[PDB]
Amino acid sequence: FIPCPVDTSQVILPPHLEKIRDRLAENIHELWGMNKIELGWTFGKIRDDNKRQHPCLVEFSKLPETEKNYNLQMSTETLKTLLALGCHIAHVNPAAEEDLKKVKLPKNYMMSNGYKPAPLDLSDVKLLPPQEILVDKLAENAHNVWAKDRIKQGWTYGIQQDLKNKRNPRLVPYALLDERTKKSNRDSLREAVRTFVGYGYNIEPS
Numbered sequence: 001f002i003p004c005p006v007d008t009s010q011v012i013l014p015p016h017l018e019k020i021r022d023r024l025a026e027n028i029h030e031l032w033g034m035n036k037i038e039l040g041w042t043f044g045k046i047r048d049d050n051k052r053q054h055p056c057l058v059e060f061s062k063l064p065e066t067e068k069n070y071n072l073q074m075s076t077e078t079l080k081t082l083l084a085l086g087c088h089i090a091h092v093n094p095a096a097e098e099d100l101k102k103v104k105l106p107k108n109y110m111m112s113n114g115y116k117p118a119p120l121d122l123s124d125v126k127l128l129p130p131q132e133i134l135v136d137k138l139a140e141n142a143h144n145v146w147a148k149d150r151i152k153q154g155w156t157y158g159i160q161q162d163l164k165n166k167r168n169p170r171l172v173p174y175a176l177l178d179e180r181t182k183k184s185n186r187d188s189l190r191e192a193v194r195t196f197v198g199y200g201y202n203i204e205p206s
Contacts, residue, residue, distance in 0.1 A: 125197050
């Protein structure tokens with residue numbers, strides 16, 4: 001009895017948002033790597049879950065084509081969702097990108113491949129109240145997107161136990177979701193909106 005997500009099928013990403021979509025996908029990967037490393041994950045030729053090695057702890061260009069199409073897609077779907085909800089996105093700050101800097105991480109983050117994540121320094125960016133509302137909307141809708149896929153793939157609500165045989169206790173309406181599970185992907189969609197403001201774009205609600 002989970003809601004339906006918003007329709008982004010007939011939404012075409014306007015070519016003036018192609019660049020910023022590539023920026024978000026780049027930073028999404030940088031944030032992913034930093035978080036993995038801070039959980040102790042190292043690089044390995046192949047991913048071992050006991051050894052905490054992963055092949056994707058690598059520079060973005062060298063990322064396999066399968067993953068880049070998943071990074072760019074999730075970023076493209078974020079933008080497509082913003083358009084469908086009634087938001088208007090415009091570039092209002094050519095100057096602002098020049099004021100953008102990547103964080104310099106210490107040496108312990110660098111791996112054997114020589115890759116060191118360099119995420120954007122978005123601490124100075126502070127969101128506006130209606131923008132912070134918009135981050136909740138994208139979070140709730142990303143959930144309905146995710147739940148729609150898993151249900152189509154044959155997943156059901158399972159009790160608090162999580163079962164590989166296609167049962168997940170997170171398959172509940174969003175209002176019923178645990179507050180701890182909300183923050184994980186809500187903090188990830190909050191940095192995405194900061195990237196837009198950071199590159200000088202303005203996300204105006206409806």
